Design a protein around this ligand. Structure first.
Ligand SMILES: Cc1cc(S(=O)(=O)N2CCC[C@H](C(N)=O)C2)cnc1N
Length: 167
């Protein structure tokens, strides 16, 4: 049993809710919240900008030190950093950004990072300002992630479309 509430069950291991991931993280304090990161961990907008703002920029400060030491992530890759006031840990995962021309096949590799964590609160990778089709992202999630994932979808209209079109 876990503390996630109000989710619709899509499969054995994937759950979905219309929710603001920031507000959901603040309330559950999950072991892992996933950030929709870029390779530079520049948390300017989208989910990343919102998560970072909720940490009062502490996520960005930590991230800048990480990059100065380690260099950029790979598209499809990830790193574990602090969850600050939102979660124990933040898994920063880089999905391909269609608006930069990155290969959507890398979306499966991005979701594979979730399998290193037993339970996660997450957004749909490569959705929103990353330009991919969220219906496709949900399909890849379901077909790739085997651990227990609680997906937060900000937009109510999109949430309803994702549920109603789910096979
Ligand atoms: C292994 C496991 C993790 C989680 S959790 O990452 O979401 N988190 C962990 C910390 C306490 C949180 C809570 N508010 O109880 C729930 C939930 N259930 C589980 N069986």
């Amino acid at each position: 049993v876990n503390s996630f509430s109000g989710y619709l069950k899509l499969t054995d291991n994937v759950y979905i809710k219309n929710a603001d991931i920031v507000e959901e993280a603040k309330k559950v304090k999950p072991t892992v919240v996933v950030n929709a990161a870029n390779v530079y961990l520049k948390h300017g907008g989208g989910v990343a900008g919102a998560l970072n703002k909720a940490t009062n920029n502490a996520m960005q400060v930590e991230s800048d030190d990480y990059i100065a030491t380690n260099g950029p992530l790979k598209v499809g890759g990830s790193c574990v950093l602090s969850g600050h006031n939102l979660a124990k840990h933040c898994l920063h995962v880089v999905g391909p950004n269609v608006n930069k021309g990155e290969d959507i096949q890398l979306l499966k590799s991005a979701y594979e990072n979730f399998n290193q964590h037993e339970v996660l609160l997450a957004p749909l990778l490569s959705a929103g300002i990353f330009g991919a089709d969220p219906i496709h992202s949900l399909r890849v999630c379901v077909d790739t992630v085997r651990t227990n994932v609680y997906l937060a979808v900000f937009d109510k209209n999109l949430y309803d479309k994702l549920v109603s079109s789910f096979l």
